[PDB]
Design a protein around this motif. Structure first.
Motif, PDB file in Angstrom:
ATOM      1  N   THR B 133       0.808  -1.215   0.000  1.00 15.11           N
ATOM      2  CA  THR B 133       0.000   0.000   0.000  1.00 15.11           C
ATOM      3  C   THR B 133       0.846   1.271   0.000  1.00 15.11           C
ATOM      4  OG1 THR B 133      -1.993   0.984   0.970  1.00 15.11           O
ATOM      5  CG2 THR B 133      -0.302   0.252   2.500  1.00 15.11           C
ATOM      6  N   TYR B 156      -4.158   4.294   7.270  1.00 13.15           N
ATOM      7  CA  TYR B 156      -3.491   3.044   7.517  1.00 13.15           C
ATOM      8  C   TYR B 156      -2.225   2.992   6.684  1.00 13.15           C
ATOM      9  CZ  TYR B 156      -2.061  -1.895   6.953  1.00 13.15           C
ATOM     10  OH  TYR B 156      -1.329  -3.058   6.889  1.00 13.15           O
ATOM     11  N   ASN B 206     -11.804  -7.973   3.240  1.00  8.66           N
ATOM     12  CA  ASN B 206     -10.886  -8.520   2.261  1.00  8.66           C
ATOM     13  C   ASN B 206     -11.635  -9.547   1.391  1.00  8.66           C
ATOM     14  OD1 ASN B 206      -8.169  -8.346   4.549  1.00  8.66           O
ATOM     15  ND2 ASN B 206      -8.186  -7.326   2.558  1.00  8.66           N
ATOM     16  N   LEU B 207     -11.139  -9.720   0.186  1.00  9.90           N
ATOM     17  CA  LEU B 207     -11.803 -10.615  -0.729  1.00  9.90           C
ATOM     18  C   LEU B 207     -11.915 -12.054  -0.316  1.00  9.90           C
ATOM     19  CD1 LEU B 207     -13.078 -11.101  -3.462  1.00  9.90           C
ATOM     20  CD2 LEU B 207     -10.767 -11.547  -4.321  1.00  9.90           C
ATOM     21  N   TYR B 210     -14.179 -13.320   2.371  1.00 12.88           N
ATOM     22  CA  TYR B 210     -15.550 -13.124   1.980  1.00 12.88           C
ATOM     23  C   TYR B 210     -15.946 -14.246   1.044  1.00 12.88           C
ATOM     24  CZ  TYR B 210     -19.958 -10.893   1.469  1.00 12.88           C
ATOM     25  OH  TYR B 210     -21.303 -10.613   1.536  1.00 12.88           O
ATOM     26  N   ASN B 223     -20.015  -9.595  -3.448  1.00 12.57           N
ATOM     27  CA  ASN B 223     -20.224  -8.330  -4.116  1.00 12.57           C
ATOM     28  C   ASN B 223     -18.890  -7.997  -4.744  1.00 12.57           C
ATOM     29  OD1 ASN B 223     -22.286  -7.414  -1.463  1.00 12.57           O
ATOM     30  ND2 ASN B 223     -22.962  -7.667  -3.547  1.00 12.57           N
ATOM     31  N   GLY B 236     -10.590  -6.072 -10.394  1.00 10.38           N
ATOM     32  CA  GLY B 236      -9.288  -5.790  -9.765  1.00 10.38           C
ATOM     33  C   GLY B 236      -8.391  -7.001  -9.735  1.00 10.38           C
ATOM     34  N   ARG B 238      -4.785  -8.622  -8.123  1.00  9.21           N
ATOM     35  CA  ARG B 238      -3.864  -8.524  -6.962  1.00  9.21           C
ATOM     36  C   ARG B 238      -2.910  -9.685  -6.938  1.00  9.21           C
ATOM     37  NH1 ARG B 238      -6.256  -4.279  -7.318  1.00  9.21           N
ATOM     38  NH2 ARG B 238      -7.449  -3.286  -5.654  1.00  9.21           N
ATOM     39  N   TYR B 240      -1.801 -12.330  -4.828  1.00  9.69           N
ATOM     40  CA  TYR B 240      -2.187 -13.094  -3.655  1.00  9.69           C
ATOM     41  C   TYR B 240      -0.994 -13.930  -3.293  1.00  9.69           C
ATOM     42  CZ  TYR B 240      -6.793 -11.147  -4.461  1.00  9.69           C
ATOM     43  OH  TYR B 240      -7.777 -10.254  -4.640  1.00  9.69           O
ATOM     44  N   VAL B 276     -10.447 -10.769  -9.405  1.00 11.24           N
ATOM     45  CA  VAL B 276     -11.493 -11.189  -8.469  1.00 11.24           C
ATOM     46  C   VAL B 276     -12.168 -12.463  -8.999  1.00 11.24           C
ATOM     47  CG1 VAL B 276     -13.630 -10.517  -7.270  1.00 11.24           C
ATOM     48  CG2 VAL B 276     -11.860  -8.819  -7.599  1.00 11.24           C
ATOM     49  N   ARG B 299     -15.139   0.292  -5.335  1.00 11.55           N
ATOM     50  CA  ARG B 299     -14.925   0.653  -3.934  1.00 11.55           C
ATOM     51  C   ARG B 299     -13.988   1.860  -3.938  1.00 11.55           C
ATOM     52  NH1 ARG B 299     -12.155  -3.794  -0.280  1.00 11.55           N
ATOM     53  NH2 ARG B 299     -10.440  -3.309  -1.725  1.00 11.55           N
ATOM     54  N   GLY B 301     -11.308   4.503  -3.597  1.00  8.95           N
ATOM     55  CA  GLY B 301      -9.902   4.313  -3.352  1.00  8.95           C
ATOM     56  C   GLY B 301      -9.294   3.042  -3.882  1.00  8.95           C
TER      57      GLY B 301
HETATM   58  C1  LIG Z   1      -6.333   0.267  -0.756  1.00  6.96           C
HETATM   59  C2  LIG Z   1      -5.833  -0.596   0.358  1.00  6.96           C
HETATM   60  O1  LIG Z   1      -4.704  -0.369   0.748  1.00  6.96           O
HETATM   61  N1  LIG Z   1      -6.698  -1.513   0.880  1.00  6.96           N
HETATM   62  C3  LIG Z   1      -6.362  -2.626   1.820  1.00  6.96           C
HETATM   63  C4  LIG Z   1      -6.701  -3.980   1.227  1.00  6.96           C
HETATM   64  O2  LIG Z   1      -6.067  -4.081  -0.025  1.00  6.96           O
HETATM   65  P1  LIG Z   1      -6.857  -4.714  -1.323  1.00  6.96           P
HETATM   66  O3  LIG Z   1      -7.885  -3.755  -1.871  1.00  6.96           O
HETATM   67  O4  LIG Z   1      -5.860  -5.089  -2.346  1.00  6.96           O
HETATM   68  O5  LIG Z   1      -7.440  -6.116  -0.898  1.00  6.96           O
HETATM   69  P2  LIG Z   1      -8.957  -6.677  -0.760  1.00  6.96           P
HETATM   70  O6  LIG Z   1      -8.834  -8.036  -0.208  1.00  6.96           O
HETATM   71  O7  LIG Z   1      -9.820  -5.745  -0.004  1.00  6.96           O
HETATM   72  O8  LIG Z   1      -9.476  -6.673  -2.276  1.00  6.96           O
HETATM   73  C5  LIG Z   1      -8.784  -7.445  -3.275  1.00  6.96           C
HETATM   74  C6  LIG Z   1      -9.593  -7.245  -4.554  1.00  6.96           C
HETATM   75  O9  LIG Z   1     -10.891  -7.825  -4.350  1.00  6.96           O
HETATM   76  C7  LIG Z   1     -11.916  -6.881  -4.535  1.00  6.96           C
HETATM   77  N2  LIG Z   1     -12.989  -7.173  -3.569  1.00  6.96           N
HETATM   78  C8  LIG Z   1     -12.689  -7.325  -2.215  1.00  6.96           C
HETATM   79  C9  LIG Z   1     -13.614  -7.618  -1.324  1.00  6.96           C
HETATM   80  C10 LIG Z   1     -14.980  -7.804  -1.725  1.00  6.96           C
HETATM   81  O10 LIG Z   1     -15.941  -8.078  -1.021  1.00  6.96           O
HETATM   82  N3  LIG Z   1     -15.202  -7.638  -3.091  1.00  6.96           N
HETATM   83  C11 LIG Z   1     -14.274  -7.333  -4.033  1.00  6.96           C
HETATM   84  O11 LIG Z   1     -14.589  -7.222  -5.200  1.00  6.96           O
HETATM   85  C12 LIG Z   1     -11.259  -5.516  -4.413  1.00  6.96           C
HETATM   86  O12 LIG Z   1     -11.913  -4.493  -5.212  1.00  6.96           O
HETATM   87  C13 LIG Z   1      -9.852  -5.797  -4.961  1.00  6.96           C
HETATM   88  O13 LIG Z   1      -9.748  -5.564  -6.390  1.00  6.96           O
HETATM   89  O14 LIG Z   1      -6.321  -5.000   2.146  1.00  6.96           O
HETATM   90  C14 LIG Z   1      -4.901  -4.972   2.362  1.00  6.96           C
HETATM   91  C15 LIG Z   1      -4.581  -6.188   3.199  1.00  6.96           C
HETATM   92  O15 LIG Z   1      -5.216  -7.309   2.673  1.00  6.96           O
HETATM   93  C16 LIG Z   1      -4.531  -3.767   3.176  1.00  6.96           C
HETATM   94  O16 LIG Z   1      -3.106  -3.762   3.371  1.00  6.96           O
HETATM   95  C17 LIG Z   1      -4.968  -2.552   2.414  1.00  6.96           C
HETATM   96  O17 LIG Z   1      -4.904  -1.432   3.294  1.00  6.96           O
END
Ligand SMILES: CC(=O)N[C@H]1[C@@H](OP(=O)(O)OP(=O)(O)OC[C@H]2O[C@@H](n3ccc(=O)[nH]c3=O)[C@H](O)[C@@H]2O)O[C@H](CO)[C@@H](O)[C@@H]1O
Ligand SMILES: NC(=O)c1ccc[n+]([C@@H]2O[C@H](COP(=O)([O-])OP(=O)(O)OC[C@H]3O[C@@H](n4cnc5c(N)ncnc54)[C@H](O)[C@@H]3O)[C@@H](O)[C@H]2O)c1
Ligand SMILES: NC(=O)c1ccc[n+]([C@@H]2O[C@H](COP(=O)([O-])OP(=O)(O)OC[C@H]3O[C@@H](n4cnc5c(N)ncnc54)[C@H](O)[C@@H]3O)[C@@H](O)[C@H]2O)c1
Ligand SMILES: CC(=O)N[C@H]1[C@@H](OP(=O)(O)OP(=O)(O)OC[C@H]2O[C@@H](n3ccc(=O)[nH]c3=O)[C@H](O)[C@@H]2O)O[C@H](CO)[C@@H](O)[C@@H]1O
Ligand SMILES: [Cl-]
Ligand SMILES: [Cl-]
Ligand SMILES: [Cl-]
Ligand SMILES: [Cl-]
Ligand SMILES: [Mg+2]
Lengths: 347, 345
Positions: B133, B156, B206-207, B210, B223, B236, B238, B240, B276, B299, B301
């Motif tokens: 981040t 954060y 977090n994804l 969920y 969602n 999105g 990431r 992992y 995702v 979402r 940011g």
């Molecule tokens: C912007 C940011 O710094 N956000 C936090 C988030 O990152 P980050 O956004 O990467 O991680 P998430 O697990 O929240 O999301 C991962 C991806 O899944 C998508 N998603 C997630 C949840 C959900 O219900 N649906 C969905 O579609 C998100 O849009 C994203 O593209 O968690 C990290 C730890 O895991 C933290 O260090 C970060 O502070």
């Protein structure tokens, strides 16, 4: 009826600000731990004892460290503050680079604690002492508030930057906070009475006090830190601002808070830059004495030129630095002459 | 020295790291305040009680807060530490933006108090939990350590960047300090045993958790936060990374400190980004369950894609992540299936 808490109020800028507050009808409560303030013969710091005399108004004071949670909590419980002006902290004495944790502890943790205590006591109006150092090495001039911040050099400047950031977030999250961040330029001069001023302990690290000390005859010659910079005369250029103007800018900041302004950031400078040689010359003129100097090596981390763009403050704050260079020099000289060895306890 | 202090050792990444430490022959001393850890029936947090059971090695633990100077003083007097792995802190429960002071207090003031005690006791070897981040909105991909940092979107993330900066300053000021700053990417998965794993309370932010909760039937549907990004599938992307590999990276960090490396910064990622939908699919394969989803708004940011350049870590730390997507999903599913309510009720 509601008080204004002034942290670090016995120091240079703080003492001058307490004086302005008293004259303007405010009721300050001042705290200081004497880290960089001289104790008077009594309970009050000498600076504030003199401010009491000058204004004919009493100064409410408590010796206390902002790091003392319990004391701070008790203070906020005892009074109903309507605002806090936060000057307390460590400033570079060229020290920061060598003692990061002291700066992080005192400035950063001390301010986090103060903010927490404030929140908890329902006081969400703050005036914060920031600095032009947050801009780092100027990418352009003059420095307006939009100039990039962060990328600061030392722990001191970084501490100021991190604090600004925190406050910005706090205001963002809670629309009820009001905070004015004042980025001071190079404070100089003294109250016109000549009774209070900058009272450095030991060999001064800053320009002006060193110059006046030479002029008064305590120091033989000024050591000029490099004369090879990309400036008109090769010497460093800075925006020197009269401490009295600076102090008055604090009163302007309190009025801004009352407008429920949210987070606001303003430079407090004159907009005019003077070189080291130009300052020596103005001091020769004020003092009526020749001021020798010698050119030595550059000082680590020194910038070539720095000066403000003071328009935002004139516009939004309703404030401008009224005192010119000769005034600054004459006022500094008066303080110096009348108090050859700075503050002392009463005889 | 001999001992390794592990702050926030009862948490997700910390508990896995404690396990790894024990298996590698290290002697950890763990501290946690239970802010985000479940208490067992005994002294130990459930996670650590399990780690103890799994490794057959004892877990030395002390319940305390990093913000407690007095407790820190007593701790450092009681044990002789050779290094500290600092996991304790607050993470976004999406919260940061709304409660800056809590973050700054726990993350900044807590870390500064810890650094002070360390300094006081001459324990100048630290491993810090940082995050990708800090890079902010990616300027290029993959993200290498050289990418710009700071200018973080949230309290954060800002907290994390400020901490790295403070540590850098400390190392500059005192050449005797050694610090490894580990920028984690997106931690997922769980120990192969299925006995420990991420234990979120409430609706997960977090994804992965969920997703696993939808598969187990705790949630109706996932969602999906936008499907209109400039990514191969619109969702999105990431990097992992399996929590086991991440934990192992901390051991590689310890060995790095022994080289008297000063301040070093490394990404801890796989270098492979997944969307995702790809994660959803892989979880359906792993769980044998269907994972319904609905596409919603982006979402605030959120970044389109974020993934690591793992070269430096491989070269310098001598570490690389070994477990891939299927493994992460298999391990995550096992944990969820075998522990439908996390560590306890
Ligand atoms: C912007 C940011 O710094 N956000 C936090 C988030 O990152 P980050 O956004 O990467 O991680 P998430 O697990 O929240 O999301 C991962 C991806 O899944 C998508 N998603 C997630 C949840 C959900 O219900 N649906 C969905 O579609 C998100 O849009 C994203 O593209 O968690 C990290 C730890 O895991 C933290 O260090 C970060 O502070
Ligand atoms: N003087 C400058 O050129 C300059 C420029 C930029 C910004 N600033 C900032 O403005 C503020 C005032 O600067 P100044 O020139 O008047 O400095 P100063 O040292 O004279 O004033 C600071 C006061 O804070 C007190 N203090 C320090 N640590 C404290 C603590 N833990 N608890 C309570 N009191 C404590 C000191 O005793 C001192 O009286 C500082 O925060 C400084 O960093 C000053
Ligand atoms: N999980 C992630 O996705 C992620 C992303 C990057 C970096 N990080 C960082 O890695 C670290 C561990 O993350 P995690 O997922 O294991 O989170 P976690 O919440 O499971 O672990 C943190 C642990 O610290 C403890 N703790 C919190 N405040 C404390 C305090 N004041 N004193 C003592 N203990 C305290 C909590 O009780 C918890 O057990 C944190 O610093 C986190 O910010 C995590
Ligand atoms: C309190 C504070 O914030 N000081 C900082 C401020 O100093 P800043 O440079 O603004 O202020 P000083 O008064 O120390 O110096 C003003 C000018 O005079 C020169 N000079 C000063 C003293 C002296 O004995 N001889 C001499 O030649 C300096 O080189 C400079 O060109 O910004 C510098 C550059 O970012 C930092 O390094 C300082 O830590
Ligand atoms: Cl009152
Ligand atoms: Cl137990
Ligand atoms: Cl021991
Ligand atoms: Cl992995
Ligand atoms: Mg303008």
């Amino acid at each position: 009826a509601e008080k204004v808490l002034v942290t670090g109020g016995a120091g240079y800028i703080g003492s001058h600000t307490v004086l302005e507050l008293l004259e303007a009808g405010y009721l300050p409560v001042v705290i200081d731990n004497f880290h960089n303030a001289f104790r008077g013969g009594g309970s009050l710091p000498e600076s504030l004892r003199r401010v009491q005399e000058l204004t004919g108004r009493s100064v409410e004071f408590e010796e206390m460290d902002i790091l003392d949670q319990g004391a701070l909590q008790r203070l906020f419980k005892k009074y109903s503050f309507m605002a806090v002006i936060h000057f307390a902290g460590l400033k570079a004495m060229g020290e920061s680079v060598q003692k990061p944790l002291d700066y992080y502890r005192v400035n950063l943790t001390g301010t986090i604690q103060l903010l927490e205590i404030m929140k908890a006591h329902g006081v969400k109006n703050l005036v914060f002492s920031s600095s032009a150092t947050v801009y780092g090495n100027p990418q352009y001039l003059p420095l307006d508030e939009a100039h990039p911040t962060g990328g600061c050099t030392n722990p001191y400047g970084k501490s100021k930057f991190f604090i600004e950031e925190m406050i910005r977030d706090l205001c963002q999250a809670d629309k009820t906070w009001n905070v004015v961040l004042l980025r001071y330029f190079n404070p100089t001069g003294a109250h016109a009475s000549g009774c209070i001023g900058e009272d450095p302990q030991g060999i001064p690290n800053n320009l002006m006090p060193y110059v006046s000390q030479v002029a008064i005859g305590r120091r033989e010659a000024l050591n000029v830190f490099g004369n090879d910079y990309d400036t008109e005369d090769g010497t460093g250029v800075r925006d020197y601002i009269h401490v009295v103007d600076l102090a008055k800018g604090h009163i302007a900041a309190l009025r801004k808070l009352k407008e429920q302004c949210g987070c606001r950031i303003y430079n407090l400078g004159t907009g005019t830059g003077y070189s080291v040689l130009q300052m020596v010359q103005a001091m020769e003129k004020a003092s009526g004495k020749k001021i020798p100097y010698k050119v030595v090596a550059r000082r680590e981390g020194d910038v070539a030129a720095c000066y403000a763009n003071p328009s935002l403050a004139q516009e939004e704050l309703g404030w401008t630095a009224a005192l010119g260079l000769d005034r600054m020099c004459e006022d500094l000289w008066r303080w110096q002459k009348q108090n050859p060895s700075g503050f002392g306890t009463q005889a």
